[PDB]
């Protein structure tokens, strides 16, 4: 009484769903091709080289595996009888390539998340020895490692079995009456997948906390002191008598000194001797000198030059210390966009792979007894279907994240919260 009825089945009878496979493969192909057109041509970081590698790996997965399932389902035959020149080799190759692509894609996503976390958190280590060579030599290394790793059943540590209705093939997990060389590969594969997913989630969380720290540091010093300066200039320009002028000027002077103590998000690695900080400090010094001469002229002696001095101060403020503020804000928004793209990709990958791990651990050593006929094959097919359908959704995320009007509305949406 073998667990799988359809292990030796040589024919297929089902509900003509080959056209559905055709339309899904067509949608995936057009999504991949439009995504590879859009940014890689019009738009043109180390993030985007990794994204490009991910898209091309996914495209080569779709162009290779969906044709075989569609052809077997269309010729009205099982996967052992679809091609007469090779009966078992088709099943072995199908399962081998499915597992290999599934592992390599997850390794690439983990590398993406780890690189972004390191870049956002620790800038000195990131700048020291991470460049476009690293972002260009990720996919060959991880793909070679996964292709070397997924060859154990061809060596003697696992088994590939055809799943009912005979149109799919995958590693066997529900074991014999009892064995030691069939538990090993299944649990090792699922353990690796779980560890990769956990590491990816942790890296995402760390990067988010570092970006929050950056936002708070920007929002305190420069931005609140700028608001104070604007309010003090307004209250000077709308005032009568020379009593409150001294108090407003002193509040403005204190705010200017505190703001001069601040640090922009960029050109912060080298605080001294940087021209981008030196002219910042020079502009604040000029503003403080103007405040000092206004105080001397209109406060030690009574005269109404304070309004003209305030107008001159506003004119020299609105000239060449707005560029730093605007550059800082723009940098923060582009960082937030990169993190959102990572978050969506991570959510998809973590969701659509846990059924496989759960099924592998459920069929192994957690079985006093299992109802076997109508309750395990229909459950086994779903995990394979989800692991396959990861491929369709991947490039459409990038298309929507770089759409003409859709991404514009999206960016207008998520900035507010």
């Amino acid at each position, epitope marked *: 009484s073998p667990f799988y009825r359809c292990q030796n089945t040589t024919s297929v009878e089902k509900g003509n769903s080959a056209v559905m496979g055709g339309v899904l493969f067509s949608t995936g192909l057009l999504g991949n091709l439009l995504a590879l057109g859009l940014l890689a041509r019009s738009g043109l970081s180390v993030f985007y080289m990794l994204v490009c590698g991910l898209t091309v790996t996914d495209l080569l997965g779709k162009c290779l595996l969906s044709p075989v399932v569609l052809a077997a389902y269309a010729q009205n035959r099982s996967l052992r009888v679809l091609a007469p020149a090779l009966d078992n080799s088709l099943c072995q190759a199908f399962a081998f390539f499915m597992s290999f692509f599934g592992l390599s894609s997850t390794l690439q996503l983990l590398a993406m998340a780890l690189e972004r976390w390191l870049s956002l958190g620790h800038p000195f280590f990131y700048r020291r020895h991470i460049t476009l060579r690293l972002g260009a030599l990720v996919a060959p290394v991880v793909s070679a490692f996964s292709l070397a790793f997924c060859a154990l059943p061809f060596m003697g540590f696992g088994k590939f079995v055809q799943y009912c209705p005979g149109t799919w093939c995958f590693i066997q997990m529900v074991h014999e009456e009892g064995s030691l060389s069939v538990l090993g590969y299944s649990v090792l594969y699922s353990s690796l997948m779980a560890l990769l997913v956990l590491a990816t989630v942790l890296c995402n969380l760390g990067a988010m906390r570092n970006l929050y720290a950056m936002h708070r540091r920007l929002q305190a010093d420069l931005e609140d002191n700028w608001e104070t300066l604007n309010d003090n200039l307004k209250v000077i320009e709308k005032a009568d008598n020379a009593a409150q002028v001294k108090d407003a000027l*002193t*509040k403005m*002077r*204190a705010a200017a*000194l*505190d703001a001069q*103590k601040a640090t922009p998000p960029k050109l912060e690695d080298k605080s001294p001797d940087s021209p981008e900080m030196k002219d910042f400090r020079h502009g604040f*010094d000029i503003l*403080v*000198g103007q405040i*000092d001469d206004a*105080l*001397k002229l209109a406060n*030690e002696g009574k005269v109404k030059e304070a309004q003209a001095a305030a107008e001159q101060l506003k004119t020299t403020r609105n000239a060449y210390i707005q560029k730093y503020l605007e550059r800082a804000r723009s940098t923060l928004l582009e960082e937030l966009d990169a993190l959102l793209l990572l978050a969506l990709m991570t959510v998809l990958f973590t969701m659509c792979s846990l059924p496989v791990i759960y099924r592998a651990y459920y069929g192994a050593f957690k079985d006093v007894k299992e109802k076997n006929r109508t309750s395990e094959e229909a459950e086994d097919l779903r995990a394979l279907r989800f692991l396959s359908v990861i491929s369709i959704v991947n490039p459409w995320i990038f298309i929507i994240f770089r759409s003409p009007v859709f991404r514009i509305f999206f960016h207008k949406i998520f900035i507010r919260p």
Partner: antibody
């Protein structure tokens, strides 16, 4: 080689007059602002008046203003404080101190040098 | 008229103690706060000049810190020559100078 030495303090009747001279040494009075400070017997410190000769700027404390005046002679390198309506509350020890100009570190260090002080007592 | 409040007024300690004095400002003066030491029959001396900076010639056991318009002067291990009176000053403009009230330290028996 920087010093600040005062003179001209002594016993005067209430309502009298007295001129206190602060004679800077080792630096030019034109390039530094200078201030007057006083301390009552068994009490704390208190600021009195301010002159900057380069800008011609002059300020006084609330009680001092209207009664005392301050002048500077650059050739003589001396600052004067003329005291015209002296009362019993003026009995104290007086100090003249310096302060530098913005920008730079000279402004950030407030009172790096004082004088030894002179005692003014008002009693009939 | 920015005011300064100094605590405590009288302190009794022994040689080798750790001493902390606190000054508080009414408004924000950024970091423009100084500390002075005076002995009977003498002119005041400067120790700290930017709420964290040591003047030349002052021994390193004197420390100063700033947090939220609260300023702290610390002596890590008191020495017999540190029995004097201490003042805190704010300086913002040439006409804006204010002193504290003082704190005297003496010997415990």
């Amino acid at each position: 080689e920087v010093q600040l030495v005062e003179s001209g303090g002594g016993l005067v009747q209430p309502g009298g007059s007295l001129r206190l001279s602060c004679a800077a040494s080792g630096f030019n009075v034109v390039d530094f602002s200078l201030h007057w400070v006083r301390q009552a017997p068994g009490k704390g410190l208190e600021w009195v008046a301010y002159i900057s000769s380069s800008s011609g700027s002059t300020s006084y404390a609330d009680s001092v203003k209207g009664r005392f005046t301050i002048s500077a002679d650059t050739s003589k390198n001396t600052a004067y404080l003329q005291m015209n309506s002296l009362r019993a509350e003026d009995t104290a020890v007086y100090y003249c101190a310096r302060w530098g100009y913005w920008p730079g570190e000279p402004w950030w260090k407030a009172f790096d040098y004082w004088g030894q002080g002179t005692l003014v007592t008002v009693s009939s | 008229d920015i005011q300064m409040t100094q605590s405590p007024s009288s302190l009794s300690a022994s040689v080798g103690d750790r001493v902390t004095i606190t000054c508080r400002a009414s408004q924000s003066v950024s970091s423009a706060v100084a500390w002075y030491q005076q002995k009977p029959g003498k002119a005041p001396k400067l120790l700290i000049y930017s709420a964290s900076s040591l003047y030349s010639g002052v021994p390193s056991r004197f420390s100063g810190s700033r947090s939220g318009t609260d300023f702290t002067l610390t002596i890590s291990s008191l020495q017999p020559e540190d029995f004097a009176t201490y003042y805190c000053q704010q300086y913002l403009y040439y006409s804006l100078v204010t002193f504290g009230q003082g704190t005297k330290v003496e010997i415990k028996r």
